[PDB]
Design a protein around this ligand. Sequence first.
Ligand SMILES: Nc1ncnc2c1ncn2[C@@H]1O[C@H](COP(=O)(O)OP(=O)(O)OP(=O)(O)O)[C@@H](O)[C@H]1O
Ligand SMILES: Nc1ncnc2c1ncn2[C@@H]1O[C@H](COP(=O)(O)OP(=O)(O)OP(=O)(O)O)[C@@H](O)[C@H]1O
Ligand SMILES: [Mg+2]
Ligand SMILES: [Mg+2]
Lengths: 349, 345
Amino acid sequence: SALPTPHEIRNHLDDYVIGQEQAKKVLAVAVYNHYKRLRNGDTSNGVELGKSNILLIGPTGSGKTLLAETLARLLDVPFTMADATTLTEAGYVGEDVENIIQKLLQKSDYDVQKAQRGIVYIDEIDKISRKSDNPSITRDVSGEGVQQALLKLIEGTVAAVPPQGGQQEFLQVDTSKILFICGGAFAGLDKVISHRVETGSGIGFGATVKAKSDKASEGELLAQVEPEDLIKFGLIPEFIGRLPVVATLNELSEEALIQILKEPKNALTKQYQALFNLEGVDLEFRDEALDAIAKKAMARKTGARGLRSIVEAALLDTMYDLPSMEDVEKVVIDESVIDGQSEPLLIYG
Amino acid sequence: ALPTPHEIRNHLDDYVIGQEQAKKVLAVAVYNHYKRLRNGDTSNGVELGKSNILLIGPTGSGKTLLAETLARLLDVPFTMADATTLTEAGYVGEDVENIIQKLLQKSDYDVQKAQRGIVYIDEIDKISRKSDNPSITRDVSGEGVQQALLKLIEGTVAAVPPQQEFLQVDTSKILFICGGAFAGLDKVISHRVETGSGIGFGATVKAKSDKASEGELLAQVEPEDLIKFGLIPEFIGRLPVVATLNELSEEALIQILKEPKNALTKQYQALFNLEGVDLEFRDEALDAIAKKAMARKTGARGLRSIVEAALLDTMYDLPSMEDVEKVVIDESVIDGQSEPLLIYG
Ligand SMILES: Nc1ncnc2c1ncn2[C@@H]1O[C@H](COP(=O)(O)OP(=O)(O)OP(=O)(O)O)[C@@H](O)[C@H]1O
Ligand SMILES: Nc1ncnc2c1ncn2[C@@H]1O[C@H](COP(=O)(O)OP(=O)(O)OP(=O)(O)O)[C@@H](O)[C@H]1O
Ligand SMILES: [Mg+2]
Ligand SMILES: [Mg+2]
């Protein structure tokens, strides 16, 4: 009856996500505004309140997809996730844009009224970016073609969704009040921002030589992202315009990674503890080991996904012989094991 | 009594700002269509013909907004479509015949009313063929759609599902309107309007300072320019009158903030009112927002990003704050060096 305040929504997100406060507020505000719009569906005012789509930009592994999954748990309206890569322009073998609404209907029991007020997430939106360098000779059905088909969907159109099979009987869903959240790990966008901001070049005496250290980081550059930068990446102005709200996720730091190992509800350390717990052994990760794991992952530049690789390598040998071993009760992992100067100590008993 | 074009233009002003040619062409076109409906019999020997309109304008100019406003004050059936979803006959994609099907549904299957209506086709620039060269690989969503609509816009008989008795409907008296952004058309116009731009003393070098703007450049658009951008000449003929919207200016944007009946400021003010808090937008703050919006190049759509960006923090914590009664948005908040003043009741 009472719409949850954004603070409560953010608290729930923190249970699974660690950091990205700016993105959390945008998502919480969007849900609060969407709920208010739904609660005010009768338009008890003198205006036709519009929507504001979000664009979750950030380095791979920052938690863009994770946020969408967590939102679907605390959401009250229908929710659905999509993949821009499979989408293709109408009239081709590839999947059509209208398929997104079909999935949303399944979550709403094929209720047009319910599906007309849900939320939708489109992951890998950066992949459909038009190949600006490529000549405008062959229609980019997989890229620019998909963006052009989503212009009316985001703004609002009577999408034709199949009526659960086989012309006629085609359902008519209006995507006017549906909220869309696009996400994608834009690769190379930082360079575009650097040229527009750094503007450091030249070889002559009257030039401005810049040191490699003065160069900013991807996170810093991405923070100062502007729509002009997206145009060079491959996004048409008609597409970015429909997405006025833009959120940026910073690059997880070493300290933040240490929290990911445990703080998240399904944190990496907890996942491996259950694996060992069901087998009858206790798994403990020393705080010192977590620091080394985070440091190694910081170099792989693979986000939180790099943490799993470090744990697997350290526990690869243990998981190969531990099941055959007997009387093993607990396994302790120290920083030395992460570096390779020791092996996990086995507490027999 | 049929309404005069001035009345139609006045209604469009309530929701649109800074668009004279668009309103005039639409009002005149609608006025002519209304007169044709009044004399549908056309007893007079002369067989009065129709003139379709083509809308050209940058993003956030009001092309899709004008069509929506027209459907409210209109009396005959109206329909909106998307050229991207359309495809030539015999393919999984949507067919052009479905356009009349939606129009027929809006008239409760009234063929008489369907034969006299208006149809708006958005994203017409999308179907534009990538290149004017021969289509080695048939463009199902490109030339195919244009060729399929050649007879529909000009006028012919179309077969639509009854509800294989495909109901026959004539499209000779139905008005069709097309709209698109045509990203890059300005370059084509410049290549034609501007010539002799190369290296040399006798050549001309604008330096980008004197170069014509996108808005005025499109105002000088000619049919030949559209051919280079990619469009079948047969399709251009079906659209004799071409309306070109101008890029909104800083002053024009400031008016769109509040003048529209459903302006952005009003929408945000109503949103806070529904929660229980009052919102006030200062005139000085509006100008600052317009300046930043004019730099995004996204048209009116950029205003929503600036407003929500400044109110992002406020809307996140305002629902928790108690006793707050009104918020004052000053120009300092727009730049980001200040926080919206909070008034505690
Ligand atoms: N802040 C975070 N808190 C908790 N887990 C996180 C966080 N960031 C990333 N993860 C982990 O990331 C994994 C999911 O990948 P994630 O959603 O981060 O990728 P992505 O950035 O959306 O990918 P893409 O490269 O396709 O754009 C999950 O295991 C989740 O635990
Ligand atoms: N002059 C204007 N006054 C008020 N609102 C405007 C104006 N121009 C655009 N808008 C806003 O534009 C939105 C509707 O989209 P619009 O018709 O501008 O699209 P467009 O620029 O033609 O898009 P595209 O060319 O990509 O199809 C509405 O939110 C409307 O408020
Ligand atoms: Mg992802
Ligand atoms: Mg439009």
